[PDB]
Amino acid sequence: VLDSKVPTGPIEQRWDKHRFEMKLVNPANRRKYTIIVVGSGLAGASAAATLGEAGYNVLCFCYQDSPRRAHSIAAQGGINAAKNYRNDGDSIYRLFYDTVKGGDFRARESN
Amino acid sequence: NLFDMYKQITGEDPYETPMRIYPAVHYTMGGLWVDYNLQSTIPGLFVIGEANFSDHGANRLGASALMQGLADGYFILPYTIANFLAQVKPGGVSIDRPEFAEAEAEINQRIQRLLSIRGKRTVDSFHRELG
Amino acid sequence: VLDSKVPTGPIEQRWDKHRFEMKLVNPANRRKYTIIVVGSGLAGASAAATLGEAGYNVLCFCYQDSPRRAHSIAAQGGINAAKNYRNDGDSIYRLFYDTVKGGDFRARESNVYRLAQVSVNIIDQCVAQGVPFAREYGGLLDNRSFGGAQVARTFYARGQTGQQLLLGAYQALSRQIAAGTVKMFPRTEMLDLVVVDGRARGIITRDMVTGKITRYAADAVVLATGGYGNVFYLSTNAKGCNATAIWRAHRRGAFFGNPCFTQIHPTCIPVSGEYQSKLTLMSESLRNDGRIWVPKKKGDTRRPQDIPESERDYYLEERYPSFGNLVPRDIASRAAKQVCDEGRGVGPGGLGVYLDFADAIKRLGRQKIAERYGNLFDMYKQITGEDPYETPMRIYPAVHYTMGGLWVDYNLQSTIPGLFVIGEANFSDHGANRLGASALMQGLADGYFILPYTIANFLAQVKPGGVSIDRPEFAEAEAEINQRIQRLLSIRGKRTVDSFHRELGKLMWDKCGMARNAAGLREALQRIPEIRAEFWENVNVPGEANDLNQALEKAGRVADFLELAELMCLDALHREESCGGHFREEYQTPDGEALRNDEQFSYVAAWEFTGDLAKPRLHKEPLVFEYVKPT
Amino acid sequence: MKITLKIWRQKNRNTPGEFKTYVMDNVNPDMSFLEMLDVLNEDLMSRGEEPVAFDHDCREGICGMCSLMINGVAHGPKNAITTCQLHMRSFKDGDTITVEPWRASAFPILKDLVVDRSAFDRIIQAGGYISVSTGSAPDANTIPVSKVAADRAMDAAACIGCGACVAACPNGSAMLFTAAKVTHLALLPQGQPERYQRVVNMVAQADFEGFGNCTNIGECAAVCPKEISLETIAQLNRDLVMAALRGIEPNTPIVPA
Amino acid sequence: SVSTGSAPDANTIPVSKVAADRAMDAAACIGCGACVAACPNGSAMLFTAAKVTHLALLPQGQPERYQRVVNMVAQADFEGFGNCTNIGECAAVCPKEISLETIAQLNRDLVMAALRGIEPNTPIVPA
């Protein structure tokens, strides 16, 4: 069986609630763990860098000459954010609604 | 920029001749199923970016794959992987375990078999037929 | 009866709702009110500076040469905030939960949430004031992990974060003094509280340079006078730290909230003789990479490095095998005190235990241990003359913090209207155990972001002025102070003030210290009146009143301590449970931890001065936990 | 250890003082200097004499009120420490130690070894701050401060205000203290709006309080407990030159209350 | 050297459009190494100059810029690249048309860092 493990309550506080309820590793103990990160694209490089900043031992891998060669480098269009810098009605809820409706209601709302 | 790149690739200026286009598969919203903690069915295996199914449903919006990858890397996985790791003991598994030997033997046998076929067809021929 | 005056509804909006519902004083009318602020520490300086910025007339007092000489410049550890700059899951709710659980569920939840909520503004204000917090190479702030937290939420300015925080507060106070909104009275010690018509309407002070007794009248009084941890003679506090102001307020009508809640520091440099009264606070991370032991033979005169491994009694290893060498500060320090009281003689006077780093140096790199504890080892070698790299370091527990103090409501107001207590002088947010980097946060929060609202709420409901220093109450308080000073100077006994303070501190450390039991507390309650009578009949205070008499200051502080200690012992005897710093030997888990009685002792004990020092009246303030359930 | 102490004894501001000789037969090498003074005070009290008055709160070299000129060196023979951090193992058996207060016009002597260092407070009051009120501060990470600038501003900011720089300066000048505060506030962006005013004001206050000038001798840095460098004085000099180029004139001096 | 979660609001620090355009001209470097290949000295001057200019032109790269250039230059010396005779083949063969103004910017930054007494750190040793 698949457990989505999504939090309960209002969707605006679901991520904050989950962050509070989830366990933590002490900054001193993070050096005791090893995380392998297969991939150095946007997700892979960001994850490896953030886990190294945290203090974990990260083993990052990529099949290319350099980590900077992942096809995330090939992306041309920009990156979306719900900052409403243009005073055009954008919001976190509007971006969430647009992403749920654009995917034709085939994804979990919490994510 | 688009017309210059098209003229470089094709040798035809789109200011005089019509440009040529053709559809091609661009993205995969599918991938390994992950829960809210970005963890797959296998405990300890986390899938982030385009390799998991995650947030795009049946159609990825523009500028969302970069957003999803950076979100998973920066602001989601550091929390969920810590949540997983705090509930387990660090270390305890070395590369001399029987599982590592079995996986390595499987990989070596696959590589040797691939090199030993020596057929009449190239790899790209089969990939082209499949595609 | 005690009215906490906490707001209702969700805990996240309680502070905003209260701030909206509080009354306000117009900026034009603020010049018509006078606020006396006794104390210039973090809480005192922040409060005086913020109230001067508001527009009030502030009368700030301190017994030191300068406001900057106040305690909490000695605070080495950083200051906590729920900014989540390390992306490690910290939040305002997480800080609130950690502070409620660290205090062992003995504090009001609303105050703790307000503290955790305003910590972020504390850090913003400190950075804007020019506090040189640690930065990383990209220009942004750097966080490090503190005790009691699994997140890196602590902002630090090298090893002297408290000094820089108090320097920023003192620079704001100096700005307000230059602007004329704050009148500073350094080297002036408040000796009494003048309560007129039921309101704290002034103070009676003594200028300890000329000996002049002065009376100041104000519309509000704030007591940011720090903790009373010097009731134990041997402590980590500054030499001048006392409880004179809060005890005078308590005798005037202020209820003492949980006076027996005292904290300790496990790692302190021991004393070299009966002359010493201060134990220098070493960082308690020295226990992470060191081993605690004493020689098995008491008369081992060999050098500690020459004692064989088999001839070393590595207690905290044989005893308490679980969590060995990382036992909580209370258990380890109780074991250390028991070992030193049995008689080992590893120190000058026998009070000390070997925290050695020899095995840590061999296991790790001496360069890495240097990068960890270089300033600590240099300071220990300066004080003791012994290099910790070769010789085992000596440590001994000492009383560090007092989570007790005058009971205050949600508005930081005592049971006396117009008397506000902030900082370590009140009970407030720490419950039964103060978390690391939480007292700096509490003092700055009270000074900057809480008291400016609550004191305005109080002042808007009263008329400015109307009380002058010629009132009979000021005359009575001044006469009481003068009679006490003359009596203290006229005893001409055979014992010094420090002799009585040492006796009192030894009794409080043995009986009302880290390990407390009913028989010992009753013995202390018998002995304290005897020591107080011996003080008032046989103390030697030389000099004159109208002179720089430091012996007079010490005599007054010890005279207040001798009364406060009886209340502390009574509160410790009354609380038939173990919670946080307060430990009872008959209420403990088999592992040695505290064993709370949440059914009968889930309240705040506010003690009322009834005129009899042995029979104060107990007022329970019930504790209800709606968000952090006790466990 | 047998230790002879020639201690300055002054009854008050107006009464002239004199050196009095006190012999201590048993002095612990582990005893700190202030603890030895405390033992002497108890002995004097037992003998009926007036105990020696000296300033002390923290006994950690952080607050700054411990202020003694021991054997001619401020804060004792050992450098980079305070009077409270000085321990009697730094001396030898039979030594004679001369204990003095700070001698400066702006640091009036109130008792045996106690001086009045409120002139430092008035120098701070004359612009040694950042004029930011409570509640108006932006987010803490809004303005980036480089790690080197933060480290230098912490080196300057680590000043305990003991006044030993004024005492060991042959001119009795507060240029190390003023320079340390000026450098601390100048090295951070938050201190940029007022710095060229601030330095002038602070310097003027040091002139008004009654301190001397800086002959660039350097005893201040030699006796500074916190090892504050003369580069703080160079930074203050640069700031004052630039402010004079900008026509910055000092405000009205802070008058004692 | 900015960690995750510590970043302020994106619009807090204003970056002028010209500075952003120049920093994007320098930042558009695909790391192909053709500058080293066509340089007669085998120098990484154009690549290092592009990165140094990209970070130096933004206010976020200021706090550690004068260290960075020195360190980066030292690394190029440690890795085994040549020196810049200002020949200019790197800009001639650069796919992204990175100008020699990046090398001039690096030279200015290194001169200023030498004036500040900036010392290179220990070079990055291959793993």
Ligand SMILES: Cc1cc2nc3c(=O)[nH]c(=O)nc-3n(C[C@H](O)[C@H](O)[C@H](O)COP(=O)(O)OP(=O)(O)OC[C@H]3O[C@@H](n4cnc5c(N)ncnc54)[C@H](O)[C@@H]3O)c2cc1C
């Ligand atoms: C031409 C193009 C244009 C695009 N434009 C946009 C756009 O405008 N907007 C948008 O939102 N998205 C766009 N995308 C999609 C987006 O770039 C990707 O979906 C996104 O980068 C996926 O994130 P990632 O972390 O998986 O990056 P990836 O680059 O996909 O990560 C792959 C990494 O894993 C490593 N790796 C892979 N397999 C192995 C293996 N077996 N062993 C070891 N390492 C391995 C690779 O070396 C590499 O480092 C575009 C994609 C392409 C191809």
Ligand SMILES: Cc1cc2nc3c(=O)[nH]c(=O)nc-3n(C[C@H](O)[C@H](O)[C@H](O)COP(=O)(O)OP(=O)(O)OC[C@H]3O[C@@H](n4cnc5c(N)ncnc54)[C@H](O)[C@@H]3O)c2cc1C
């Ligand atoms: C060595 C040490 C390290 C510490 N480190 C930390 C730490 O890292 N983090 C943390 O959160 N807490 C720490 N603390 C605890 C806390 O910061 C301080 O102990 C302090 O008590 C809190 O500041 P405060 O303003 O409330 O008290 P104080 O700063 O002690 O306030 C006392 C003020 O009141 C004045 N005053 C007192 N009595 C009178 C009187 N009778 N008349 C007139 N004026 C009077 C004094 O002159 C002074 O100005 C530490 C404590 C010590 C001793």
Ligand code: SF4
């Ligand atoms: S500059 Fe040094 S010597 Fe002068 S007051 Fe400050 S700490 Fe003391």
Ligand code: SF4
């Ligand atoms: S040739 Fe241009 S794009 Fe390629 S590495 Fe050199 S500078 Fe970068």
Ligand code: F3S
């Ligand atoms: S010693 Fe004196 S001459 Fe100047 S540099 Fe210091 S104040």
Ligand code: F3S
């Ligand atoms: S061609 Fe060579 S000399 Fe310098 S400008 Fe380019 S690396």
Ligand code: FES
């Ligand atoms: S007593 Fe505080 S610096 Fe010496």
